[PDB]
């Protein structure tokens, strides 16, 4: 089982740091955690998504690979992966005790709350993903690398540098698999199971964008950065 080469240890350092610097209340999200009590539950939800989107943008900008792409590609990739990454970041903070996910590193929500907030079935998918990820014990590095894989999706429509984005994805997937080899998780077939979690996150991304098209509720009720990334 090959382990990370020197240059992959370097890329792992870079992508882990980008994640840790833009991940809300890193490793102090549970003690600093409040709970919440209809286009009013949606209201409470839309006033808090803007900083979650802002952090994803911030994460991408700390990837030199991302910064080398032309702005029109950068916009398209962020539109594609933004809800996938906020969803992963929320799912890795599933608390089995309270049965909550954590948004913006301080707000605990239940399945029912997120659903009433307008996510519909996507709420059930994010919670099932969180429950199945408790036994995966993903560290900052594995989360950062999943995020980089989702960001560098060559298949988003209207991209100019399809080939280059594909090569970045391949570099991240190889380093990630090598790191996974090194970490020797106590879960059979770990890497195949992780590729299936990527697929789950991509379905969350495509269902999220689908649901947005269906919730024309006046658009002005929704924050601008949230109607841009759909």
């Amino acid at each position: 089982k090959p382990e990370p080469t020197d240059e992959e240890w370097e890329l792992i350092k870079t992508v882990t740091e980008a994640h840790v610097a833009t991940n809300a209340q890193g490793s102090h999200w549970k003690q600093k955690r409040k709970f919440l009590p209809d286009l009013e539950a949606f209201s409470h939800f839309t006033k808090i998504i803007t900083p979650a989107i802002t952090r994803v943008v911030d994460f991408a900008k700390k990837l030199p690979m991302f910064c080398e792409l032309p702005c029109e590609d950068q916009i398209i990739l962020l539109k594609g992966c933004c809800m996938e990454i906020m969803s992963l970041r929320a799912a890795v903070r599933y608390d089995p005790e309270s049965e909550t996910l954590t948004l913006n590193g301080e707000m605990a929500v239940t399945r029912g709350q997120l659903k009433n907030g307008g996510l519909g079935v996507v709420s059930d998918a994010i919670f099932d993903l969180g429950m199945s990820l408790s036994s995966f014990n993903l560290d900052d590095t594995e989360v950062a690398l999943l995020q980089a894989v989702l960001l560098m999706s060559s298949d988003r429509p209207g991209l100019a540098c399809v080939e280059r984005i594909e090569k970045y994805q391949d570099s991240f997937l190889l380093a990630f698999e090598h790191y996974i080899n090194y970490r020797k998780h106590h879960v059979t077939h770990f890497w195949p199971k992780l590729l299936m979690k990527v697929t789950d996150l991509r379905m969350i991304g495509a269902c999220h964008a689908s649901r947005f098209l269906h919730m024309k509720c006046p658009t002005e009720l929704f924050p601008p950065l949230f109607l841009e990334v759909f």
């Binding site: 943008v57 900008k61 539109k79 841009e228």
Partner: peptide
């Protein structure tokens, strides 16, 4: 369109 994304992206 994507006027705010473009703002946050350039810096």
């Amino acid at each position: 369109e994507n006027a705010l994304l473009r703002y946050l992206l350039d810096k």
